[PDB]
């Protein structure tokens, strides 16, 4: 019967925007090349997490404005037992700054658009951010926003300010964000003043949670006698034709009857009443086959059909 020995020289380095590198070394006394002892890492704060690794380092993505706390230990898992050393721990102190100076209510929206003319036929993502000034933030502070997607990091330059000159919004017409992206967009906003020091704020956004899908265009509807035909084009997006869920709303303006069709197609042909005026709208979302559930687009601006006479 014997036990394990804890790792040493446990460090935590800020390598990037919401990006940390955890490093440590194997305990000198323990066995050298026992290839099936590994390391367990536990994140104690801000959010509790737990995972294994076999390397003496670990890169991780997490917010850093609330500080950071991690523990690492040596483990050996038989499938009857788990053997564990004591924890070695390390921390990153919460960034300096008086209370309430930090930005509140950060909101971010991405949108897919196209170029212009024959430069290349592709898609740009635009990023729009808004927020409120810190409540007791000294009237002098200026706020600055950075974002990181993948390897790319940028600072904004097109700001919208309030009445006392402070940045409360940001506009990126062109960005490094992938239109079909799965990765996490990291946004940091720090600030500066002559008096007090300002608490930086930062957030992690999954693209599917903030991608503002565009509305379907050229919604066309016609009634020929008893036959109703609705067509519409796939919205402006990098995701192809077969990746969209559609909801077609057919509203009877006379009696308020509301017919809603859910379909993955681009045209709906069916039967309807001659003698009522209808307004139709269509909205779209990205299918779960192509990406985890996200947001619905706005409704197409309504078109009218029936009672042509």
């Amino acid at each position: 019967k014997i036990s394990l020995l804890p790792p040493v020289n446990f460090t935590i380095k800020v390598t990037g925007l919401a990006q940390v590198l955890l490093q440590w070394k194997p305990n000198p006394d323990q066995e050298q090349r026992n290839v099936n002892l590994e390391y367990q890492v536990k994140i104690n704060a801000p959010k509790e997490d737990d995972y294994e690794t076999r390397i003496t380092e670990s890169k991780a993505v997490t917010i850093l404005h609330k500080g950071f706390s991690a523990s690492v230990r040596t483990i050996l898992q038989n499938d009857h037992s788990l053997l564990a050393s004591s924890w070695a721990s390390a921390e990153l102190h919460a960034p300096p700054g008086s209370p309430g100076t930090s930005i509140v209510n950060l909101t971010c929206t991405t949108n897919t658009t196209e170029d212009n003319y024959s430069r290349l036929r592709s898609y740009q993502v635009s990023l729009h951010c808004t927020w409120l000034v810190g409540t007791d933030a000294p009237e002098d502070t200026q706020y600055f926003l950075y974002y990181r997607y993948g390897s790319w990091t940028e600072e904004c330059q097109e700001y919208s300010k309030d009445t006392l000159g402070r940045n409360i919004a940001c506009w990126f017409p062109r960005t490094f964000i992938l239109s079909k992206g799965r990765d996490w967009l990291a946004v940091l906003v720090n600030g500066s003043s002559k008096h007090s020091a300002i608490r930086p704020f930062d957030q992690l956004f999954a693209l599917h949670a903030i991608d503002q899908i565009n509305p379907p265009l050229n919604v066309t509807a016609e009634i020929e006698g008893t036959r109703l035909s609705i067509q519409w084009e796939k919205p402006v997006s990098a995701f192809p034709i077969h990746c969209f869920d559609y909801e077609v709303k057919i509203h009877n303006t006379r009696n308020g009857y509301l017919q809603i069709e859910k379909l993955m197609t681009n045209a709906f042909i069916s039967i309807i009443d001659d003698l009522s005026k209808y307004d139709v709208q269509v909205r779209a979302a990205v299918s779960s086959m192509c990406r985890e559930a996200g947001l619905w687009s706005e409704w197409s601006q309504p078109i009218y059909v029936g009672f042509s006479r």
């Binding site: 890492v41 690794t53 380092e57 890169k59 991780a60 993505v61 997490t62 917010i63 799965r182």
Partner: peptide, 18 residues
């Protein structure tokens, strides 16, 4: 070298975007 990114808040791993 040769490890993925640990997405902490989502308890997940992330590698690439081929």
């Amino acid at each position: 070298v040769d490890e993925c990114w640990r997405i902490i808040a989502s308890h997940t791993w992330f590698c690439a975007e081929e």
